[PDB]
Amino acid sequence: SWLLRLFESKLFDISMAISYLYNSKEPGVQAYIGNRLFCFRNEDVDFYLPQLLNMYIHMDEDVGDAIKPYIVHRCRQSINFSLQCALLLGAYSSRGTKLRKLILSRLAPEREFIKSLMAIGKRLATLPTKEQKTQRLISELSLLNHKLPARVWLPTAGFDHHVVRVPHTQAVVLNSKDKAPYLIYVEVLECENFDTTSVPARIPENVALKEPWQEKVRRIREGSPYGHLPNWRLLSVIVKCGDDLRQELLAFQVLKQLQSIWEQERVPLWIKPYKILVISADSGMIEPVVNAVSIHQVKKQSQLSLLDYFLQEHGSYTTEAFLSAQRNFVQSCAGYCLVCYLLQVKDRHNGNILLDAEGHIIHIDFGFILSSSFKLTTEFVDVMGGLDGDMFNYYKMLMLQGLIAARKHMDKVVQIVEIMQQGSQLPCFHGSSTIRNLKERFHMSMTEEQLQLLVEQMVDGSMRS
Amino acid sequence: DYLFKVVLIGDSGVGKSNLLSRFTRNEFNLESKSTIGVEFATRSIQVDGKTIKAQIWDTRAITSAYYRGAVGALLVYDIAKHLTYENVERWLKELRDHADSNIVIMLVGNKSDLRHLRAVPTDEARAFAEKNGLSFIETSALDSTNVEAAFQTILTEIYRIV
Ligand SMILES: COc1ccc(-c2c(C)nc3c(NCCNC(C)=O)cc(Cl)nn23)cc1S(=O)(=O)N1CCOCC1
Ligand SMILES: Nc1nc2c(ncn2[C@@H]2O[C@H](COP(=O)(O)OP(=O)(O)OP(O)(O)=S)[C@@H](O)[C@H]2O)c(=O)[nH]1
Numbered sequence: 001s002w003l004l005r006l007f008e009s010k011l012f013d014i015s016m017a018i019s020y021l022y023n024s025k026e027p028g029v030q031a032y033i034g035n036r037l038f039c040f041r042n043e044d045v046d047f048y049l050p051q052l053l054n055m056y057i058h059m060d061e062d063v064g065d066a067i068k069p070y071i072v073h074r075c076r077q078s079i080n081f082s083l084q085c086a087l088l089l090g091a092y093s094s095r096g097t098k099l100r101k102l103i104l105s106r107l108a109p110e111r112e113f114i115k116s117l118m119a120i121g122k123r124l125a126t127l128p129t130k131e132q133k134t135q136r137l138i139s140e141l142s143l144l145n146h147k148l149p150a151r152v153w154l155p156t157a158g159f160d161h162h163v164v165r166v167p168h169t170q171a172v173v174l175n176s177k178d179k180a181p182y183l184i185y186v187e188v189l190e191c192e193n194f195d196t197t198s199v200p201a202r203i204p205e206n207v208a209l210k211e212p213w214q215e216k217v218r219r220i221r222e223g224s225p226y227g228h229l230p231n232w233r234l235l236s237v238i239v240k241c242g243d244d245l246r247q248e249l250l251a252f253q254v255l256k257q258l259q260s261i262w263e264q265e266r267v268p269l270w271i272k273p274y275k276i277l278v279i280s281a282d283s284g285m286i287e288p289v290v291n292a293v294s295i296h297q298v299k300k301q302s303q304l305s306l307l308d309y310f311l312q313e314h315g316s317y318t319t320e321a322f323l324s325a326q327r328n329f330v331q332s333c334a335g336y337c338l339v340c341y342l343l344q345v346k347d348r349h350n351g352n353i354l355l356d357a358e359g360h361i362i363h364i365d366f367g368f369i370l371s372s373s374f375k376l377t378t379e380f381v382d383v384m385g386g387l388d389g390d391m392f393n394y395y396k397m398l399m400l401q402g403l404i405a406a407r408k409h410m411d412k413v414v415q416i417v418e419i420m421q422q423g424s425q426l427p428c429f430h431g432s433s434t435i436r437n438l439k440e441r442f443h444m445s446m447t448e449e450q451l452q453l454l455v456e457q458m459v460d461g462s463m464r465s
Numbered sequence: 466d467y468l469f470k471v472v473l474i475g476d477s478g479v480g481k482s483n484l485l486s487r488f489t490r491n492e493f494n495l496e497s498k499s500t501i502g503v504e505f506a507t508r509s510i511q512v513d514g515k516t517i518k519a520q521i522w523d524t525r526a527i528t529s530a531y532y533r534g535a536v537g538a539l540l541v542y543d544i545a546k547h548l549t550y551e552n553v554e555r556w557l558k559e560l561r562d563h564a565d566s567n568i569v570i571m572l573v574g575n576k577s578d579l580r581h582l583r584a585v586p587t588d589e590a591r592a593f594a595e596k597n598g599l600s601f602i603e604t605s606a607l608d609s610t611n612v613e614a615a616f617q618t619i620l621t622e623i624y625r626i627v
Pocket of ligand 2: 026029032477479496577607
């Protein structure tokens with residue numbers, strides 16, 4: 001009764017459920033939890049959808065069959081949910097096909113919307129320069145508009161909605177590479193429920209520059225047919241036609257968990273998970289951070305040192321705007337340092353770190369992590385006021401605090417990674433001890449005095465270059 | 466006073482041993498050590514003013530000790546596992562090969578608590594139930610629901626063979 005006792009206690013959450021489901025070989029428990037999934041709030045379970053669906057594919061039939069009923073139920077009340085299921089099912093197997101086909105068995109409007117977006121991206125491959133790609137993109141996006149408002153939506157969107165219009169002139173391509181990703185803006189009309197609501201009606205059609213996000217909404221709004229409606233909102237996604245995002249998704253979950261952990265404890269670290277949408281093992285979409293640009297390009301347009309740019313855009317070190325910006329910098333540095341260490345994130349450079357208008361940094365390219373094979377440069381230390389600085393001392397204090405916090409919730413993190421490794425051919429699971437090494441990196445055995453030293457050691461390492 | 470022998474048969478996993486532990490020791494467990502070979506267990510109740518004692522048989526290859534001296538037999542299936550209901554037909558050909566031709570049968574759907582995972586509707590079962598010569602009920606072994614009821618039902622029904 002002691003097991004059943006626990007499961008009926010307050011202690012029972014979606015996390016625990018998945019853990020037992022993943023580990024327990026008892027079919028009575030597996031089936032029991034499969035049923036208990038229904039009692040939880042939709043939102044809590046949603047976060048673990050990639051794990052659940054992964055289990056279904058790669059685990060014993062017993063395990064799948066316990067999961068399926070809940071899945072089908074959700075699939076039946078939400079096509080969005082249906083969509084994300086179908087997309088994930090396909091991407092994670094290269095058993096799967098049967099449930100996928102059953103769910104797709106309807107979604108054609110959306111699937112064609114997504115197909116076209118992917119199709120667009122692949123054509124730009126023949127155009128060897130960034131600037132050339134953009135013009136081909138803009139024209140062909142205009143053709144989408146010809147497709148009417150289509151009762152299709154961006155799953156990457158926080159809410160249910162219909163897409164009405166694509167402001168093609170505002171879209172831009174981000175690099176000159178062979179399979180370059182591209183950023184687009186999308187107009188949508190918010191819903192109360194997608195599943196019950198008429199696709200909006202077409203409204204007949206009668207310049208792009210570096211600007212803040214809200215100014216861009218202004219500019220786009222004034223020109224748009226649909227802009228007058230209160231229902232109207234502007235979304236944005238990056239389209240990656242030839243890059244795998246399954247590792248990207250995994251990092252997202254880890255970032256999201258770590259964010260909650262530091263949130264649950266009261267450690268004011270700052271980080272920013274950006275939404276991921278897996279479409280295939282080939283292709284995906286990303287919800288971009290607005291009001292942000294790369295440090296590298298920040299340095300090429302400003303001609304300044306990182307500290308100098310801060311001073312320009314916010315004010316001198318005696319101003320609030322600066323001290324606020326410095327503070328946001330320091331908290332975001334400690335956060336991402338910790339993320340980089342724990343996940344062993346590599347290929348870290350100023351091309352991969354964004355700076356937002358409030359002073360936070362944001363890491364972005366989560367290739368090269370874990371088994372697959374962070375820097376405190378003086379430019380960064382300067383913004384912090386230097387090594388002897390109080391704000392710098394504060395940076396070290398947060399890392400220890402954030403480490404102590406992480407240790408208190410290690411299992412939630414490892415779970416995400418450890419499940420994902422399942423039947424996986426991803427480079428991040430290449431080692432024999434990926435999860436084993438990961439656990440070692442939390443240093444659960446260490447005393448706080450020991451951790452202070454380890455934190456110190458970490459910082460010293462980050463400076464050598 | 467009196468002595469009523471009842472057997473439990475059905476597919477593996479359907480919940481016989483916990484039916485037995487609920488009914489006879491009022492105990493349940495999610496973690497499970499397999500029954501090796503055979504058990505009975507006993508508890509006495511009263512029906513129609515008379516003190517009775519019930520003998521329940523918990524089932525490898527079916528030796529014919531089972532189905533020996535059974536006035537009644539509870540044939541149990543898991544509502545949440547359709548196959549177990551499907552095999553109720555094969556469990557009755559067995560039972561006619563190895564058991565008394567005037568024996569009391571209750572069809573039992575166990576694990577009624579798994580509402581959202583239900584794979585066998587009560588109506589389909591009860592249709593088959595009264596379509597045939599079996600008595601019918603749904604129980605849940607995990608929570609103490611209808612476990613007592615089930616026995617007391619079959620036991621009351623039995624003494625009526627005066
Ligand atoms: C998978 O790798 C990425 C991860 C994050 C992002 C991103 C996110 C979440 N947000 C932004 C962003 N924000 C500005 C939005 N518009 C404004 C100015 O408001 C700008 C850029 Cl260039 N990227 N990006 C992009 C990419 S990538 O498009 O595949 N590419 C990778 C190689 O390095 C360049 C970017
Ligand atoms: N949700 C739910 N789970 C149950 C129920 N009954 C049993 N389980 C689980 O089913 C599993 C089956 O084990 P068991 O009790 O031995 O059944 P059995 O196989 O029919 O018993 P036996 O005759 O082979 S020894 C148990 O782990 C038990 O925890 C129930 O009524 N509801």
